[PDB]
Design a protein around this motif. Structure first.
Motif, PDB file in Angstrom:
ATOM      1  N   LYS A 132    -101.791  -6.632  10.489  1.00 39.68           N
ATOM      2  CA  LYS A 132    -100.519  -6.539   9.979  1.00 39.68           C
ATOM      3  C   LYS A 132     -99.693  -7.934   9.967  1.00 39.68           C
ATOM      4  N   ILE A 133     -98.475  -7.787   8.989  1.00 44.36           N
ATOM      5  CA  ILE A 133     -97.718  -9.227   9.011  1.00 44.36           C
ATOM      6  C   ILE A 133     -96.484  -8.443   9.452  1.00 44.36           C
ATOM      7  CG2 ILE A 133     -96.453 -10.693   7.410  1.00 44.36           C
ATOM      8  CD1 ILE A 133     -99.351 -11.307   7.798  1.00 44.36           C
ATOM      9  N   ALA A 134     -96.047  -8.811  10.763  1.00 41.74           N
ATOM     10  CA  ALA A 134     -94.777  -8.568  11.387  1.00 41.74           C
ATOM     11  C   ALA A 134     -93.650  -8.456  10.445  1.00 41.74           C
ATOM     12  CB  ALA A 134     -94.641  -9.587  12.639  1.00 41.74           C
ATOM     13  N   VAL A 160    -102.485  -0.253  -1.351  1.00 42.02           N
ATOM     14  CA  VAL A 160    -103.801  -0.874  -1.656  1.00 42.02           C
ATOM     15  C   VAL A 160    -103.982  -2.052  -0.799  1.00 42.02           C
ATOM     16  CG1 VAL A 160    -103.461  -2.557  -3.604  1.00 42.02           C
ATOM     17  CG2 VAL A 160    -105.642  -1.306  -3.405  1.00 42.02           C
ATOM     18  N   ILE A 161    -103.193  -2.716  -0.250  1.00 40.25           N
ATOM     19  CA  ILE A 161    -103.414  -4.285   0.287  1.00 40.25           C
ATOM     20  C   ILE A 161    -103.497  -3.811   2.012  1.00 40.25           C
ATOM     21  CG2 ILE A 161    -102.364  -6.287   1.437  1.00 40.25           C
ATOM     22  CD1 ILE A 161    -101.037  -6.488  -1.235  1.00 40.25           C
ATOM     23  N   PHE A 162    -102.406  -3.263   2.716  1.00 44.05           N
ATOM     24  CA  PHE A 162    -102.392  -2.900   3.776  1.00 44.05           C
ATOM     25  C   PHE A 162    -102.951  -1.651   4.508  1.00 44.05           C
ATOM     26  CE2 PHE A 162     -99.042  -5.639   3.041  1.00 44.05           C
ATOM     27  CZ  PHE A 162     -99.330  -6.696   3.989  1.00 44.05           C
ATOM     28  N   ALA A 163    -103.548  -0.806   3.363  1.00 42.04           N
ATOM     29  CA  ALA A 163    -104.133   0.441   3.881  1.00 42.04           C
ATOM     30  C   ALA A 163    -105.363   0.072   4.529  1.00 42.04           C
ATOM     31  CB  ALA A 163    -104.712   1.153   2.645  1.00 42.04           C
ATOM     32  N   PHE A 185     -96.737  -5.938  -7.070  1.00 36.08           N
ATOM     33  CA  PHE A 185     -95.703  -6.772  -7.570  1.00 36.08           C
ATOM     34  C   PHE A 185     -95.710  -8.123  -6.629  1.00 36.08           C
ATOM     35  CE2 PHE A 185     -93.509  -3.779 -10.389  1.00 36.08           C
ATOM     36  CZ  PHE A 185     -92.933  -4.978 -11.342  1.00 36.08           C
ATOM     37  N   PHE A 186     -95.755  -7.724  -5.388  1.00 37.17           N
ATOM     38  CA  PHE A 186     -95.635  -8.852  -4.352  1.00 37.17           C
ATOM     39  C   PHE A 186     -96.834  -9.684  -4.628  1.00 37.17           C
ATOM     40  CE2 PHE A 186     -96.449  -9.458   0.162  1.00 37.17           C
ATOM     41  CZ  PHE A 186     -95.524 -10.447   0.357  1.00 37.17           C
ATOM     42  N   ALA A 187     -97.923  -9.273  -4.517  1.00 43.56           N
ATOM     43  CA  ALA A 187     -98.991 -10.089  -4.847  1.00 43.56           C
ATOM     44  C   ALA A 187     -99.085 -10.618  -6.188  1.00 43.56           C
ATOM     45  CB  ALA A 187    -100.488  -9.173  -4.563  1.00 43.56           C
ATOM     46  N   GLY A 188     -99.155  -9.849  -7.343  1.00 43.61           N
ATOM     47  CA  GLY A 188     -99.130 -10.659  -8.595  1.00 43.61           C
ATOM     48  C   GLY A 188     -98.029 -11.425  -8.933  1.00 43.61           C
ATOM     49  N   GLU A 231     -95.770 -13.229  -6.843  1.00 45.18           N
ATOM     50  CA  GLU A 231     -95.683 -14.415  -5.982  1.00 45.18           C
ATOM     51  C   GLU A 231     -96.781 -15.341  -5.740  1.00 45.18           C
ATOM     52  OE1 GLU A 231     -93.391 -16.841  -3.499  1.00 45.18           O
ATOM     53  OE2 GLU A 231     -92.748 -15.213  -4.495  1.00 45.18           O
ATOM     54  N   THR A 232     -98.055 -15.155  -5.739  1.00 46.74           N
ATOM     55  CA  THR A 232     -99.261 -16.281  -5.754  1.00 46.74           C
ATOM     56  C   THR A 232     -99.531 -16.994  -6.821  1.00 46.74           C
ATOM     57  OG1 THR A 232     -99.745 -15.358  -3.488  1.00 46.74           O
ATOM     58  CG2 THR A 232    -101.145 -16.986  -4.678  1.00 46.74           C
ATOM     59  N   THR A 233     -99.386 -16.155  -8.059  1.00 51.00           N
ATOM     60  CA  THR A 233     -99.801 -16.779  -9.150  1.00 51.00           C
ATOM     61  C   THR A 233     -98.752 -17.541  -9.672  1.00 51.00           C
ATOM     62  OG1 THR A 233    -100.522 -14.391  -9.645  1.00 51.00           O
ATOM     63  CG2 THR A 233    -101.043 -16.060 -11.289  1.00 51.00           C
ATOM     64  N   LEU A 278    -102.468 -21.873  -1.525  1.00 48.45           N
ATOM     65  CA  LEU A 278    -101.335 -20.884  -1.466  1.00 48.45           C
ATOM     66  C   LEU A 278    -101.076 -19.930  -0.359  1.00 48.45           C
ATOM     67  CD1 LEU A 278     -99.741 -22.473  -3.281  1.00 48.45           C
ATOM     68  CD2 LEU A 278    -101.869 -21.823  -4.517  1.00 48.45           C
ATOM     69  N   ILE A 279    -102.246 -19.724   0.286  1.00 51.85           N
ATOM     70  CA  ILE A 279    -102.478 -18.723   1.415  1.00 51.85           C
ATOM     71  C   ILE A 279    -103.199 -19.195   2.367  1.00 51.85           C
ATOM     72  CG2 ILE A 279    -102.786 -16.366   1.951  1.00 51.85           C
ATOM     73  CD1 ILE A 279    -102.367 -15.383  -0.682  1.00 51.85           C
ATOM     74  N   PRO A 280    -102.650 -19.999   3.226  1.00 48.13           N
ATOM     75  CA  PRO A 280    -103.090 -20.915   4.409  1.00 48.13           C
ATOM     76  C   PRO A 280    -103.944 -20.281   5.523  1.00 48.13           C
ATOM     77  CG  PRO A 280    -101.223 -21.797   3.702  1.00 48.13           C
ATOM     78  CD  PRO A 280    -101.159 -20.559   2.795  1.00 48.13           C
ATOM     79  N   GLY A 298    -105.220 -16.958   5.158  1.00 47.49           N
ATOM     80  CA  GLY A 298    -105.486 -15.724   4.847  1.00 47.49           C
ATOM     81  C   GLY A 298    -104.537 -14.708   4.745  1.00 47.49           C
ATOM     82  N   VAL A 299    -104.863 -13.221   4.643  1.00 51.45           N
ATOM     83  CA  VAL A 299    -104.175 -12.315   5.053  1.00 51.45           C
ATOM     84  C   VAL A 299    -104.919 -11.998   6.387  1.00 51.45           C
ATOM     85  CG1 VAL A 299    -103.073  -9.892   4.589  1.00 51.45           C
ATOM     86  CG2 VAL A 299    -103.447 -12.082   3.009  1.00 51.45           C
ATOM     87  N   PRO A 300    -104.391 -11.345   7.371  1.00 47.12           N
ATOM     88  CA  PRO A 300    -104.980 -10.713   8.658  1.00 47.12           C
ATOM     89  C   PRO A 300    -106.070  -9.695   8.292  1.00 47.12           C
ATOM     90  CG  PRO A 300    -102.692 -11.129   8.955  1.00 47.12           C
ATOM     91  CD  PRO A 300    -102.925 -11.470   7.775  1.00 47.12           C
ATOM     92  N   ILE A 351    -111.764  -9.032  -0.698  1.00 51.42           N
ATOM     93  CA  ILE A 351    -111.661 -10.379  -1.423  1.00 51.42           C
ATOM     94  C   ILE A 351    -110.489  -9.800  -2.590  1.00 51.42           C
ATOM     95  CG2 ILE A 351    -113.445  -9.753  -3.118  1.00 51.42           C
ATOM     96  CD1 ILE A 351    -113.497 -12.434  -3.982  1.00 51.42           C
ATOM     97  N   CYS A 352    -109.665 -10.741  -2.973  1.00 50.42           N
ATOM     98  CA  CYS A 352    -108.227 -10.271  -3.632  1.00 50.42           C
ATOM     99  C   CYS A 352    -108.779  -9.322  -5.091  1.00 50.42           C
ATOM    100  CB  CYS A 352    -107.787 -11.619  -4.273  1.00 50.42           C
ATOM    101  SG  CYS A 352    -106.414 -11.068  -5.475  1.00 50.42           S
ATOM    102  N   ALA A 353    -108.059  -8.125  -4.993  1.00 48.32           N
ATOM    103  CA  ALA A 353    -108.194  -7.197  -5.956  1.00 48.32           C
ATOM    104  C   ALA A 353    -107.820  -7.505  -7.487  1.00 48.32           C
ATOM    105  CB  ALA A 353    -107.482  -6.087  -5.547  1.00 48.32           C
ATOM    106  N   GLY A 412     -96.520 -21.110   5.558  1.00 48.69           N
ATOM    107  CA  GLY A 412     -96.507 -19.942   6.357  1.00 48.69           C
ATOM    108  C   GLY A 412     -97.582 -18.952   6.034  1.00 48.69           C
ATOM    109  N   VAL A 413     -97.313 -17.632   5.761  1.00 49.34           N
ATOM    110  CA  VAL A 413     -98.284 -16.776   5.319  1.00 49.34           C
ATOM    111  C   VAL A 413     -98.497 -17.221   3.881  1.00 49.34           C
ATOM    112  CG1 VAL A 413     -97.406 -14.966   4.224  1.00 49.34           C
ATOM    113  CG2 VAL A 413     -99.150 -14.462   5.283  1.00 49.34           C
ATOM    114  N   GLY A 414     -97.663 -17.927   3.292  1.00 42.47           N
ATOM    115  CA  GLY A 414     -97.752 -18.581   2.054  1.00 42.47           C
ATOM    116  C   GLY A 414     -97.425 -19.838   2.024  1.00 42.47           C
TER     117      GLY A 414
HETATM  118 CL1  LIG Z   1     -98.665 -10.695   3.445  1.00 43.62          CL
HETATM  119  C1  LIG Z   1     -99.351 -11.072   2.143  1.00 43.62           C
HETATM  120  C2  LIG Z   1    -100.192 -10.283   1.582  1.00 43.62           C
HETATM  121  C3  LIG Z   1    -100.881 -10.519   0.345  1.00 43.62           C
HETATM  122  C4  LIG Z   1    -100.490 -11.848  -0.371  1.00 43.62           C
HETATM  123  C5  LIG Z   1    -101.107 -11.661  -1.515  1.00 43.62           C
HETATM  124  C6  LIG Z   1    -102.404 -11.164  -2.071  1.00 43.62           C
HETATM  125  N1  LIG Z   1    -102.643 -11.659  -3.380  1.00 43.62           N
HETATM  126  C7  LIG Z   1    -101.902 -12.563  -3.602  1.00 43.62           C
HETATM  127  N2  LIG Z   1    -100.758 -12.486  -2.749  1.00 43.62           N
HETATM  128  C8  LIG Z   1     -99.305 -12.176  -0.001  1.00 43.62           C
HETATM  129  C9  LIG Z   1     -98.595 -12.107   1.018  1.00 43.62           C
END
Ligand SMILES: Clc1ccc(-c2cnc[nH]2)cc1
Ligand code: HEM
Length: 465
Positions: free
Chosen positions: A73-75, A86-89, A269-272, A274-276, A335-337, A339-341, A408-410, A449-451
């Motif tokens: 989880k991300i606090a 689909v991410i935190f499930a 949306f969050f994934a798509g 912000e990181t790209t 961009l994601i130093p 990873g995601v936990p 791995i990233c969907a 941070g997480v990103g």
């Molecule tokens: Cl907490 C969190 C989780 C996942 C992402 C993500 C996955 N793929 C692109 N960004 C970013 C931040």
């Protein structure tokens, strides 16, 4: 048994004393030195096992893939997901959504045109917007977030927004703040002491509020779909989900219900978005710093694509130099130093240790992106890392920007296509410049941070002859 080595914790504070004021990543990287590639640090109550370097991460994620297929989880955002989406499930809910989510993104978008076709068409929209600026200096952050959003938007709502639409700008706005606070220092702190901090004020509230406003929007859009819905012709990701939700009306074990829809669409949306988006934004800061690389890219675009047709995805296998520059943008931009936990799905024996079921595992993607065992001179930008003597693309085990294994990233296929089509399509039609001279440009992330959030910068896009 036994957990991996670490500093002795202090109950309720854990290893807070063995941390580093910089942030969670520097804390992990420093501890690494004393305790090796695998260790156990305490973020308040929470015992987390950190993994470092290509080899460790790969052995865990790939070698014992199912064992390590769990999600932590991300606090600062858990209050919002609480294990849905689909991410935190996790467990059976996860497998169900991911399977659905892959297939569905693959064939539905506005227009029943391909994911590639939408990205191509966004690129065309982007180019025209950029011509309107007549080459004046701008900040590409907004635009760069705009074009990533519209891909998810086309996929999930079945429509793109005009760049200047206020509904949209308002949406992007909420988005813009949250994503940067997620990585702020406070949220790193909040990670150790959410128990305590969850109560007083902080940025977790504006994060929480902001995300809820987005959810409200996904809410409305769902309802509009739910009503206009036509079974003969699903229009997009949302209809496809409803049509499945109905195929399942008599199944009490189906995970396809409201919460998973909202939090899933939020996740795409969050994934798509912000990181790209920050990857592209960071790639162009490097192109300002290495005009010589930029120029070589533009020349390959010329030999292979030419100046008249828009870049197509399968132009990439013909353009290893550019492909290498994108690999090298992802690797360094990192961009994601951490990873995601993850969590282990069971008591696991790993490198002579025992990791108890459900313990959060942090696969520190960055320590593999900068792992000297695999990249000469890891902190300098060199597309060379991915080129052989003949200038052919060259796979490198250490390069895992999307992580590895069953989680791995969907979206890696979509993200990679975005990177390639946006990069080539902008450079085909534009030259870039900055007031700042190259040697002066500082790639040091504004927030880590997480990103990773790259610094803002001025850039101009000069229409090509
Ligand atoms: Cl907490 C969190 C989780 C996942 C992402 C993500 C996955 N793929 C692109 N960004 C970013 C931040
Ligand atoms: C452009 C650069 C991108 C990078 C570097 C990236 C990276 C990552 C990383 C590191 C993870 C964590 C994987 C793990 O440790 O388990 C992840 C997960 C995920 N990503 Fe991305 N991502 C990018 C873009 C996207 C896009 C565009 C989408 C969707 C369209 C997307 C969708 C997802 C989803 C749904 C997950 C969760 C998968 C799961 O847990 O089963 N990503 N990504």
């Amino acid at each position: 048994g036994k957990l991996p080595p670490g500093p002795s914790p202090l109950p309720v504070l854990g290893n807070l004393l063995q941390m580093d004021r910089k942030g969670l990543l520097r804390s992990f990287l420093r501890l690494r030195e004393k305790y090796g590639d695998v260790f156990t640090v305490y973020l308040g109550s929470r015992p987390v096992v950190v993994l470092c370097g290509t080899d460790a991460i790969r052995e865990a994620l790939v070698d014992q893939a199912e064992a390590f297929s769990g999600r932590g989880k991300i606090a600062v955002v858990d209050p919002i997901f609480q294990g849905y989406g689909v991410i935190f499930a996790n467990g059976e809910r996860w497998r169900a959504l991911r399977r659905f989510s892959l297939a569905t993104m693959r064939d539905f978008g506005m227009g029943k045109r391909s994911v590639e076709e939408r990205i191509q068409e966004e690129a065309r929209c982007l180019v025209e917007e950029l011509r309107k600026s007549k080459g004046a200096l701008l900040d590409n952050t907004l635009l760069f977030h705009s074009i990533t959003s519209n891909i998810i938007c086309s996929i999930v709502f079945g429509k793109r927004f005009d760049y200047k639409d206020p509904v949209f700008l308002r949406l992007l706005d909420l988005f813009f703040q949250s994503f940067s606070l997620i990585s702020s220092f406070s949220s790193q702190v909040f990670e150790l002491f959410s128990g305590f901090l969850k109560y007083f004020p902080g940025t977790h509230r504006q994060i929480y509020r902001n995300l809820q406003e987005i959810n409200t929007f996904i809410g409305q859009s769902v309802e509009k779909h739910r009503a206009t819905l036509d079974p003969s012709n699903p229009r997009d990701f949302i209809d496809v989900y409803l049509l499945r939700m109905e195929k399942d009306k008599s199944d009490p074990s189906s995970e396809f219900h409201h919460q998973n829809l909202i939090l899933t669409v939020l996740s795409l949306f969050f994934a798509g978005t912000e990181t790209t988006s920050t990857t592209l934004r960071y790639g162009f800061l490097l192109m300002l710093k290495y005009p010589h690389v930029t120029e070589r890219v533009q020349k390959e675009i010329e030999q292979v694509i030419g100046s008249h047709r828009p870049p197509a995805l399968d132009d990439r296998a013909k353009m290893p130099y550019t492909d290498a520059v994108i690999h090298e943008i992802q690797r360094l931009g990192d961009l994601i130093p951490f990873g995601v936990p993850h969590t282990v799905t069971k008591d696991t024996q790993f490198r002579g240790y025992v990791i108890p079921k459900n313990t959060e595992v942090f696969p520190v993607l960055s320590s593999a992106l900068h792992d000297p065992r695999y990249f000469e001179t890891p902190n300098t930008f060199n597309p060379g890392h991915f080129l052989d003597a003949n200038g052919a693309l060259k796979r490198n085990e250490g390069f895992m920007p999307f992580s590895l294994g069953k989680r791995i990233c969907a979206g890696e296929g979509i993200a990679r296509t975005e990177l390639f089509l946006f990069f080539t399509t902008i450079l085909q039609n534009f030259s870039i410049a900055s007031p700042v001279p190259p040697e002066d440009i500082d790639l040091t992330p504004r927030e880590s941070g997480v990103g990773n959030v790259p610094p803002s910068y001025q850039i101009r896009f000069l229409a090509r002859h």
